[PDB]
Amino acid sequence: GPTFQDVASQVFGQPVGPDNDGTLYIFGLTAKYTEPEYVDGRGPYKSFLKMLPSIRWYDPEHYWTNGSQTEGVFKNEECVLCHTVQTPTIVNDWKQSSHGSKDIRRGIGIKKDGKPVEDLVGCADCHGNNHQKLEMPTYKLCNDCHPKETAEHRAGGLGSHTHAYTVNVLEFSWHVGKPAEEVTGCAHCHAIAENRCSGCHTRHKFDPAEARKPTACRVCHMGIDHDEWAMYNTSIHGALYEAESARMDWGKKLKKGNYRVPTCAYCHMQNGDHNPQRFGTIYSDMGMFQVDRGAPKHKAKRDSWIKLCQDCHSPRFAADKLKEMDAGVNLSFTKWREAAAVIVGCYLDGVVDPMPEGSAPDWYGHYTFSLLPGGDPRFYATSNLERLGLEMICYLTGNVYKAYAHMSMYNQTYGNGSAFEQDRKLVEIKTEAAKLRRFAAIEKKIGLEHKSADFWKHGEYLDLLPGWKRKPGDVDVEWFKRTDIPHRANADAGVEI
Amino acid sequence: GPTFQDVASQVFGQPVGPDNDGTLYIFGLTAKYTEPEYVDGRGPYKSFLKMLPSIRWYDPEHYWTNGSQTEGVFKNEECVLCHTVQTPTIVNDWKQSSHGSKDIRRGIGIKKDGKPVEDLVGCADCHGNNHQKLEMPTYKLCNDCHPKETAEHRAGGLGSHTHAYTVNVLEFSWHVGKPAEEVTGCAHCHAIAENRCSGCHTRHKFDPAEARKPTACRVCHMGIDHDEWAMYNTSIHGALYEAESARMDWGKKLKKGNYRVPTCAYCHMQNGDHNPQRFGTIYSDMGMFQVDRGAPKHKAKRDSWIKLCQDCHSPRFAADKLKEMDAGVNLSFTKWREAAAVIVGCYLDGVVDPMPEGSAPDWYGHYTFSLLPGGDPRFYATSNLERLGLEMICYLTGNVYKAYAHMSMYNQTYGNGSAFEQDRKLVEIKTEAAKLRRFAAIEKKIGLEHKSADFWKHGEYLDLLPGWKRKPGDVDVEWFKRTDIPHRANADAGVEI
Amino acid sequence: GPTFQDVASQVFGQPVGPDNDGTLYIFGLTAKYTEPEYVDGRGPYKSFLKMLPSIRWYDPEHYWTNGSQTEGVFKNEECVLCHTVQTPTIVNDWKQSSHGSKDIRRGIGIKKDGKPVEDLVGCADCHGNNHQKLEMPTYKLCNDCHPKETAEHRAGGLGSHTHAYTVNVLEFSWHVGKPAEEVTGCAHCHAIAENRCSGCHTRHKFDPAEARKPTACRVCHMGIDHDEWAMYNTSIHGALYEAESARMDWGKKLKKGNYRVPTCAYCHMQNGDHNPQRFGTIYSDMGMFQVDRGAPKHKAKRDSWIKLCQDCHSPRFAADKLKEMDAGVNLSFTKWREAAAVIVGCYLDGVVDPMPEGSAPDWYGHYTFSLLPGGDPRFYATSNLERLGLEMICYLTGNVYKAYAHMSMYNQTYGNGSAFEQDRKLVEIKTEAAKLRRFAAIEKKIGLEHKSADFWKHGEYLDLLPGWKRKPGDVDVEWFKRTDIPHRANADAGVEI
Ligand code: HEC
Ligand code: HEC
Ligand code: HEC
Ligand code: HEC
Ligand code: HEC
Ligand code: HEC
Ligand code: HEC
Ligand code: HEC
Ligand code: HEC
Ligand code: HEC
Ligand code: HEC
Ligand code: HEC
Question: Which of the two ends of chain A, N or C, has the fewest CB atoms closer than 10 A to its terminal CB?
Answer without folding.
Answer: N
